[PDB]
Design a protein around this motif. Structure first.
Motif, PDB file in Angstrom:
ATOM      1  N   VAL A   1      38.646  30.396  26.752  1.00  0.00           N
ATOM      2  CA  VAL A   1      38.487  31.668  26.057  1.00  0.00           C
ATOM      3  C   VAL A   1      37.800  31.406  24.727  1.00  0.00           C
ATOM      4  N   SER A   2      36.829  32.244  24.394  1.00  0.00           N
ATOM      5  CA  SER A   2      36.191  32.155  23.087  1.00  0.00           C
ATOM      6  C   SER A   2      37.178  32.572  22.004  1.00  0.00           C
ATOM      7  N   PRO A   3      37.423  31.729  20.997  1.00  0.00           N
ATOM      8  CA  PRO A   3      38.382  32.111  19.947  1.00  0.00           C
ATOM      9  C   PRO A   3      37.989  33.381  19.216  1.00  0.00           C
ATOM     10  N   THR A   4      36.688  33.621  19.042  1.00  0.00           N
ATOM     11  CA  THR A   4      36.245  34.885  18.466  1.00  0.00           C
ATOM     12  C   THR A   4      36.575  36.052  19.389  1.00  0.00           C
ATOM     13  N   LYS A   5      36.360  35.877  20.693  1.00  0.00           N
ATOM     14  CA  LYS A   5      36.615  36.929  21.678  1.00  0.00           C
ATOM     15  C   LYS A   5      38.079  36.875  22.119  1.00  0.00           C
ATOM     16  N   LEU A   6      38.953  37.316  21.214  1.00  0.00           N
ATOM     17  CA  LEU A   6      40.380  37.372  21.490  1.00  0.00           C
ATOM     18  C   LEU A   6      41.015  38.723  21.206  1.00  0.00           C
ATOM     19  N   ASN A   7      40.377  39.574  20.411  1.00  0.00           N
ATOM     20  CA  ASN A   7      40.894  40.903  20.124  1.00  0.00           C
ATOM     21  C   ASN A   7      40.385  41.954  21.100  1.00  0.00           C
ATOM     22  N   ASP A   8      39.610  41.550  22.105  1.00  0.00           N
ATOM     23  CA  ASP A   8      39.010  42.462  23.070  1.00  0.00           C
ATOM     24  C   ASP A   8      39.516  42.166  24.480  1.00  0.00           C
ATOM     25  N   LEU A   9      40.611  41.416  24.584  1.00  0.00           N
ATOM     26  CA  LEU A   9      41.138  40.979  25.869  1.00  0.00           C
ATOM     27  C   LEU A   9      42.600  41.376  26.001  1.00  0.00           C
ATOM     28  N   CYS A  10      42.988  41.768  27.212  1.00  0.00           N
ATOM     29  CA  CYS A  10      44.373  42.070  27.546  1.00  0.00           C
ATOM     30  C   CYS A  10      44.933  40.925  28.378  1.00  0.00           C
ATOM     31  N   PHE A  11      46.086  40.406  27.972  1.00  0.00           N
ATOM     32  CA  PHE A  11      46.637  39.193  28.553  1.00  0.00           C
ATOM     33  C   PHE A  11      47.828  39.512  29.447  1.00  0.00           C
ATOM     34  N   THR A  12      48.024  38.674  30.466  1.00  0.00           N
ATOM     35  CA  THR A  12      49.144  38.861  31.382  1.00  0.00           C
ATOM     36  C   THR A  12      50.450  38.385  30.755  1.00  0.00           C
TER      37      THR A  12
ATOM     38  N   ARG B   1      58.230  32.596  24.947  1.00  0.00           N
ATOM     39  CA  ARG B   1      57.481  33.591  25.698  1.00  0.00           C
ATOM     40  C   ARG B   1      57.171  34.788  24.810  1.00  0.00           C
ATOM     41  N   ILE B   2      56.002  35.387  25.028  1.00  0.00           N
ATOM     42  CA  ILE B   2      55.565  36.551  24.266  1.00  0.00           C
ATOM     43  C   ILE B   2      55.621  37.775  25.168  1.00  0.00           C
ATOM     44  N   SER B   3      56.308  38.813  24.704  1.00  0.00           N
ATOM     45  CA  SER B   3      56.496  40.054  25.437  1.00  0.00           C
ATOM     46  C   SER B   3      55.487  41.096  24.958  1.00  0.00           C
ATOM     47  N   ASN B   4      55.655  42.329  25.433  1.00  0.00           N
ATOM     48  CA  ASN B   4      54.716  43.394  25.109  1.00  0.00           C
ATOM     49  C   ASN B   4      54.661  43.634  23.607  1.00  0.00           C
ATOM     50  N   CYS B   5      53.449  43.739  23.084  1.00  0.00           N
ATOM     51  CA  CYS B   5      53.200  43.893  21.655  1.00  0.00           C
ATOM     52  C   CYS B   5      51.715  44.185  21.474  1.00  0.00           C
ATOM     53  N   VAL B   6      51.278  44.246  20.225  1.00  0.00           N
ATOM     54  CA  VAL B   6      49.858  44.294  19.886  1.00  0.00           C
ATOM     55  C   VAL B   6      49.571  43.061  19.032  1.00  0.00           C
ATOM     56  N   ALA B   7      49.021  42.032  19.668  1.00  0.00           N
ATOM     57  CA  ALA B   7      48.778  40.756  19.010  1.00  0.00           C
ATOM     58  C   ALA B   7      47.344  40.708  18.504  1.00  0.00           C
ATOM     59  N   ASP B   8      47.182  40.721  17.185  1.00  0.00           N
ATOM     60  CA  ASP B   8      45.878  40.570  16.550  1.00  0.00           C
ATOM     61  C   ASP B   8      45.662  39.089  16.275  1.00  0.00           C
ATOM     62  N   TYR B   9      44.664  38.503  16.928  1.00  0.00           N
ATOM     63  CA  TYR B   9      44.384  37.082  16.742  1.00  0.00           C
ATOM     64  C   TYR B   9      43.381  36.860  15.615  1.00  0.00           C
ATOM     65  N   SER B  10      43.670  37.475  14.469  1.00  0.00           N
ATOM     66  CA  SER B  10      42.940  37.217  13.232  1.00  0.00           C
ATOM     67  C   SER B  10      43.831  37.142  12.004  1.00  0.00           C
ATOM     68  N   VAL B  11      45.074  37.632  12.062  1.00  0.00           N
ATOM     69  CA  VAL B  11      45.978  37.574  10.921  1.00  0.00           C
ATOM     70  C   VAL B  11      46.856  36.334  10.941  1.00  0.00           C
ATOM     71  N   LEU B  12      46.756  35.508  11.981  1.00  0.00           N
ATOM     72  CA  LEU B  12      47.476  34.244  12.025  1.00  0.00           C
ATOM     73  C   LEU B  12      46.748  33.134  11.280  1.00  0.00           C
ATOM     74  N   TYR B  13      45.551  33.411  10.756  1.00  0.00           N
ATOM     75  CA  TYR B  13      44.789  32.407  10.025  1.00  0.00           C
ATOM     76  C   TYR B  13      45.466  31.992   8.725  1.00  0.00           C
ATOM     77  N   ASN B  14      46.400  32.797   8.217  1.00  0.00           N
ATOM     78  CA  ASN B  14      47.108  32.491   6.981  1.00  0.00           C
ATOM     79  C   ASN B  14      48.403  31.727   7.224  1.00  0.00           C
ATOM     80  N   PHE B  15      48.473  30.943   8.300  1.00  0.00           N
ATOM     81  CA  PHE B  15      49.675  30.196   8.637  1.00  0.00           C
ATOM     82  C   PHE B  15      49.485  28.688   8.668  1.00  0.00           C
TER      83      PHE B  15
END
Lengths: 49, 49
Positions: free
Chosen positions: B37-48, B12-26
């Motif tokens: 969800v659009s993979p590009t449109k992921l840094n402009d969304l707040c998740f439950t 489970r993922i708790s409160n944080c600031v998740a940037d879905y662009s720096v995981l590309y180096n994994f």
């Protein structure tokens, strides 16, 4: 729009816009029938008056 | 410690600031297609959760 990119958002949008049109076309169609019903009553009132 | 299919590892993922662009180096990201969800449109969304 904020969740889906344009390439496949329009697929989802197309279902919404066609759904609301069927809701909108239903509204006016019932309005036209109701307007005819009122006009018949309005004509009756004018004849009565 | 990636687990088996019959008993997968759930995190489970708790409160944080998740940037879905720096995981590309994994990973080479053989399959990266998303569903609702659009993979590009992921840094402009707040998740439950």
């Amino acid at each position: 729009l904020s969740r889906l990119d344009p390439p496949e958002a329009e697929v989802q949008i197309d279902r919404l816009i066609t759904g609301r049109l069927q809701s909108l076309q239903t509204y006016v169609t019932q309005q036209l029938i109701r307007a005819a019903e009122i006009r018949a009553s309005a004509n009756l009132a004018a004849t009565k008056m | 410690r990636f687990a088996s299919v019959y008993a997968w590892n759930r995190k489970r993922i708790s409160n944080c600031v998740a940037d879905y662009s720096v995981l590309y180096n994994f990973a080479p990201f053989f399959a990266f297609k998303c569903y609702g969800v659009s993979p590009t449109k992921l840094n402009d969304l707040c998740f439950t959760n």
